[PDB]
Design a binder for this molecule. Sequence first.
Ligand SMILES: Nc1ncnc2c1ncn2[C@@H]1O[C@H](CSCC[C@H](N)C(=O)O)[C@@H](O)[C@H]1O
Ligand SMILES: [Cl-]
Length: 234
Amino acid sequence: ATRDEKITYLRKIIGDKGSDAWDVAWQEGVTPWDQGKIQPPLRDFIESNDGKALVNKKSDNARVLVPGCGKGYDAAYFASLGYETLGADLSSTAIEKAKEFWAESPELKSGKLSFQTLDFFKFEVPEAKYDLVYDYTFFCALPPDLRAPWGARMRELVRPGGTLITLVYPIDGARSGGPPYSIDVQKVTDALQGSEEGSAEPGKYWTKVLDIVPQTSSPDHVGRERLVVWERIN
Ligand SMILES: Nc1ncnc2c1ncn2[C@@H]1O[C@H](CSCC[C@H](N)C(=O)O)[C@@H](O)[C@H]1O
Ligand SMILES: [Cl-]
């Protein structure tokens, strides 16, 4: 019933079942990541001068992807900003629970917000790709050996000149084990910028336009969190 017990159990069933463990955890109510709401740094970015500018330039058919969305607080938030938004999660249980949690959303009603059981690695990316993608407790949910695929998928998911926001948490140093895996901005950078081979300035696929300590974090997130905004180039 404690967080640690639940984490221990979560990691145990991931060891036995692999990625199938996530729907199992959702069915059994072992969801220690679940916070019931978006993280404050997301709202404060959108409400900042850079965030206002990003939202104001959005095209009329701009699309948002929130992968590993869980109960979907972030997808609901982006939909409320006027974006046609898809919350994608591997667990059909999670997706139903998201549909319940946001049952009264006006954007769920209109179809502007949609929740779908999808594998982030496998689903067919729309032709137009995504204008804006938001990753929170998804990169850190993945085994380390899946970080490179995630970077590659992000590269094809975000249209040129589109934006990926990564709320990088938890930044816990050398702590081993996960999920949540201890991550840092460098690990996200390496995944997103791929293989150098030339060992040069990695800004080939993305420009890291903003990398900040959020001014308001959840109490438990203070000192373990950076918000980073990436723009797709080439
Ligand atoms: N390949 C994959 N594709 C889509 N979702 C995945 C996935 N692997 C794991 N997930 C989902 O990633 C989520 C990690 S838990 C955190 C969920 C959400 N970001 C929140 O902040 O509450 C789980 O819901 C899990 O079902
Ligand atoms: Cl919320």
